[PDB]
Amino acid sequence: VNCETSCVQQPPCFPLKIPPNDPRIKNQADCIPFFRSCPACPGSNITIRNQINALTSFVDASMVYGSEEPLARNLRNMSNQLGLLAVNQRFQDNGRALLPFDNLHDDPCLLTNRSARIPCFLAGDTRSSEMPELTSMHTLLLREHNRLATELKSLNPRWDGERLYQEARKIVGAMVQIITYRDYLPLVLGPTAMRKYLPTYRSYNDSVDPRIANVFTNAFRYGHTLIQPFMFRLDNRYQPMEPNPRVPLSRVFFASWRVVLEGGIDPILRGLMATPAKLNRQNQIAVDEIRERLFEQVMRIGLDLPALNMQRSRDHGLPGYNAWRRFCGLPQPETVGQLGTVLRNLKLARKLMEQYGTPNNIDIWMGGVSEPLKRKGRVGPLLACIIGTQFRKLRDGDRFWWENEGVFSMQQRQALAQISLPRIICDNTGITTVSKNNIFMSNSYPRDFVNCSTLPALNLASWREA
Amino acid sequence: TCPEQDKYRTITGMCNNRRSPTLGASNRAFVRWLPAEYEDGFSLPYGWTPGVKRNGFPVALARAVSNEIVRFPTDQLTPDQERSLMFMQWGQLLDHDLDFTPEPAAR
Numbered sequence: 001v002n003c004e005t006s007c008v009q010q011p012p013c014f015p016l017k018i019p020p021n022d023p024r025i026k027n028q029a030d031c032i033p034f035f036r037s038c039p040a041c042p043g044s045n046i047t048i049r050n051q052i053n054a055l056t057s058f059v060d061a062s063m064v065y066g067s068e069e070p071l072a073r074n075l076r077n078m079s080n081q082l083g084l085l086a087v088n089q090r091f092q093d094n095g096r097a098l099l100p101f102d103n104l105h106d107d108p109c110l111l112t113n114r115s116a117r118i119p120c121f122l123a124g125d126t127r128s129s130e131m132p133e134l135t136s137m138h139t140l141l142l143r144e145h146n147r148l149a150t151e152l153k154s155l156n157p158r159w160d161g162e163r164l165y166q167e168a169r170k171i172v173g174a175m176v177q178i179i180t181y182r183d184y185l186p187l188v189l190g191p192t193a194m195r196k197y198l199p200t201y202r203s204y205n206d207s208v209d210p211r212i213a214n215v216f217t218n219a220f221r222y223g224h225t226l227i228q229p230f231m232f233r234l235d236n237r238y239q240p241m242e243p244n245p246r247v248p249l250s251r252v253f254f255a256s257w258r259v260v261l262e263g264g265i266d267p268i269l270r271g272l273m274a275t276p277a278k279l280n281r282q283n284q285i286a287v288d289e290i291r292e293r294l295f296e297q298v299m300r301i302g303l304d305l306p307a308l309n310m311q312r313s314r315d316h317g318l319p320g321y322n323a324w325r326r327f328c329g330l331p332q333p334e335t336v337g338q339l340g341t342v343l344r345n346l347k348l349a350r351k352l353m354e355q356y357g358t359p360n361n362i363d364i365w366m367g368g369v370s371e372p373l374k375r376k377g378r379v380g381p382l383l384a385c386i387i388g389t390q391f392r393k394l395r396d397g398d399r400f401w402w403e404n405e406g407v408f409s410m411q412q413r414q415a416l417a418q419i420s421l422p423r424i425i426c427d428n429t430g431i432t433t434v435s436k437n438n439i440f441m442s443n444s445y446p447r448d449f450v451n452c453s454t455l456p457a458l459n460l461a462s463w464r465e466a
Numbered sequence: 467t468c469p470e471q472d473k474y475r476t477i478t479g480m481c482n483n484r485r486s487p488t489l490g491a492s493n494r495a496f497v498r499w500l501p502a503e504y505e506d507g508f509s510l511p512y513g514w515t516p517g518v519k520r521n522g523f524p525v526a527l528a529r530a531v532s533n534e535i536v537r538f539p540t541d542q543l544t545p546d547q548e549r550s551l552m553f554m555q556w557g558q559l560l561d562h563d564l565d566f567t568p569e570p571a572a573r
């Protein structure tokens with residue numbers, strides 16, 4: 001149109017307008033770029049506007065393998081019968097594999113460092129290069145597939161390229177499910193909400209709708225409150241790696257060159273393990289690195305992620321705070337005093353009432369992250385409900401869930417239960433000292449760290465087809 | 467279509483549910499847990515037309531709400547003593563396994 005360079009409000013542009021006395025954007029004629037999420041039924045008078053999911057809802061490691069067949073076929077190593085994923089042909093991380101470069105028309109990763117000439121990476125998801133911390137996670141999973149496919153070749157020399165790929169895909173897909181539902185989710189929802197929304201798994205239910213809810217796309221953006229203003233990198237002895245140990249986040253966005261040229265995925269992964277996350281507090285919601293300086297290097301102006309979240313919820317036509325409270329079976333505050341009781345914060349309730357006028361109008365993300373966190377959890381009652389309800393549907397409505405009868409054998413499940421994220425790091429990086437379980441809880445060195453020698457690897461003896 | 471017996475997942479996600487093979491598959495519409503709330507009832511988002519109130523109250527600018535509620539001094543950050551930054555980063559990685567909402571390109 002462009003929505004990226006213009007402030008005129010015409011389809012499909014819905015740009016964020018600038019209020020008087022803005023701390024950063026002094027020009028009131030300016031605006032924040034915003035494309036409306038394109039509808040599933042374009043230009044229809046009959047159907048209520050709804051948005052599209054480009055990925056598989058299932059926890060099936062589609063961020064690694066892809067959600068479309070042309071893309072999935074391009075991500076594979078098609079040269080041999082080993083069933084590997086394609087690796088970077090120009091650069092390596094100390095002998096270890098890296099994600100292949102993407103051939104894009106307007107490549108944002110080149111704009112981060114102009115003399116570096118390092119383009120964005122190619123993975124199952126298009127956002128792989130958004131931040132080096134995410135890239136490190138993508139690369140780690142790519143190496144895991146290749147490591148598994150190699151060991152499966154030893155156990156079964158009869159297996160061809162197709163068989164080896166699919167079997168390794170099945171394991172990595174199971175690995176992500178285990179780390180999510182055993183290690184991650186209990187620490188998000190807390191013990192109380194974990195038992196309510198995710199009780200013990202029985203078996204596959206073909207009557208459970210496995211689709212992603214529209215609200216979840218905005219609700220699961222709670223993690224934007226956990227983001228630290230810096231990217232942290234440490235050497236093999238877990239000390240601030242020089243000369244850039246504490247890099248501002250506005251200068252790491254799409255900075256794919258920092259992985260290729262400035263060390264590798266090892267210093268980044270050691271940082272994520274030994275650095276505390278940001279705590280969500282009612283007067284400390286989200287840092288200015290994403291609130292003022294989001295994609296500052298690759299855009300005309302820096303974006304406001306929390307504001308983009310609230311704009312998107314309106315774009316998606318999502319109901320307000322109280323409507324989702326009622327949905328969850330939670331009380332709906334009418335007055336400022338009642339909102340204060342719900343939030344344990346009358347000061348915050350006032351500020352919310354100043355903006356919205358009614359708790360009915362509060363954007364889902366805003367009212368969600370505003371709620372006091374559940375005991376031993378990192379979300380309030382409302383977010384726990386939406387996130388919890390979603391992940392059960394993804395579990396019970398998945399025919400290829402790892403615990404389901406017929407997906408794996410008894411000994412295969414018994415071996416798969418032994419996997420952990422720290423162990424995946426041990427097997428695929430040059431790091432010899434990793435976090436104690438739970439990895440998402442362990443954040444201090446050397447108190448919460450153990451050697452890789454004390455941690456056993458995945459036993460693939462049960463995958464032998466004798 | 468669908469095959470009566472399969473061993474692995476399809477890339478698109480098709481055939482995971484036998485009775486409705488498009489559920490959970492890529493490039494399909496989101497499911498709604500509540501009816502959508504739009505300015506015109508079906509298409510226009512709230513804050514599109516100036517002066518039009520949502521539920522009897524003026525619509526606040528998303529940036530303005532971000533300025534008054536979300537904004538805080540960076541050096542005042544409270545570090546989580548019980549969570550690692552990997553707790554955050556796995557969240558994004560997992561989010562990118564579940565959903566991506568597409569947008570039109572320019573022009």
Ligand SMILES: *[C@@H]1O[C@H](CO[C@@H]2O[C@@H](C)[C@@H](O)[C@@H](O)[C@@H]2O)[C@@H](O[C@@H]2O[C@H](CO)[C@@H](O[C@@H]3O[C@H](CO[C@@H]4O[C@H](CO)[C@@H](O)[C@H](O)[C@@H]4O)[C@@H](O)[C@H](O[C@@H]4O[C@H](CO)[C@@H](O)[C@H](O)[C@@H]4O)[C@@H]3O)[C@H](O)[C@H]2NC(C)=O)[C@H](O)[C@H]1NC(C)=O
Pocket residue numbers: 205206207208392393396
């Ligand atoms: C396989 O799973 C499905 C789906 O389970 C759901 O998702 C799970 C992940 C989990 O979250 C679970 O809690 C969910 O239920 C199961 O099928 C469901 O069974 C329940 C219980 O039988 C059904 O609830 C009933 O819904 C009836 C429909 O009436 C209405 O529907 C409206 C439109 O959506 C809605 O506005 C209303 O809220 C209401 O739901 C309703 O007539 C029933 O009324 C009850 O009657 C009981 C006595 O007969 C009584 O005790 C109770 O007080 C109440 O009056 C009841 O609410 C649900 O509709 C089913 N969902 C689907 C999509 O089929 C199934 O049980 C699972 N099977 C196995 C093998 O485990």
Ligand code: HEM
Pocket residue numbers: 130131134216217218220221222223224227305308309312554555557558561565566567568
């Ligand atoms: C590494 C830190 C993170 C980012 C950088 C980042 C950025 C974004 C952006 C720009 C969007 C689009 C917002 C818009 O509509 O304009 C976005 C959307 C989503 N997020 Fe963000 N995010 C970072 C961090 C996280 C973490 C840790 C998350 C998980 C707890 C998380 C969630 C999400 C989700 C689910 C979306 C919507 C996905 C979709 O396209 O449907 N983010 N993120």
Ligand SMILES: *[C@@H]1O[C@H](CO)[C@@H](O)[C@H](O)[C@H]1NC(C)=O
Pocket residue numbers: 077078079080084085086087088089
């Ligand atoms: C495919 O695998 C072979 C042998 O392991 C390797 O030499 C080659 O680099 C791989 N090809 C790609 C494009 O990843």
Ligand SMILES: *[C@@H]1O[C@H](CO)[C@@H](O)[C@H](O)[C@H]1NC(C)=O
Pocket residue numbers: 113114115116257261
């Ligand atoms: C960009 O990358 C180059 C390496 O090609 C490096 O020399 C330079 O310092 C980087 N630019 C800055 C200042 O970030």
Ligand SMILES: [Ca+2]
Pocket residue numbers: 055056057058059060061062063563564
């Ligand atoms: Ca998926």
Ligand SMILES: [Cl-]
Pocket residue numbers: 213214215216497498499500
């Ligand atoms: Cl919804």
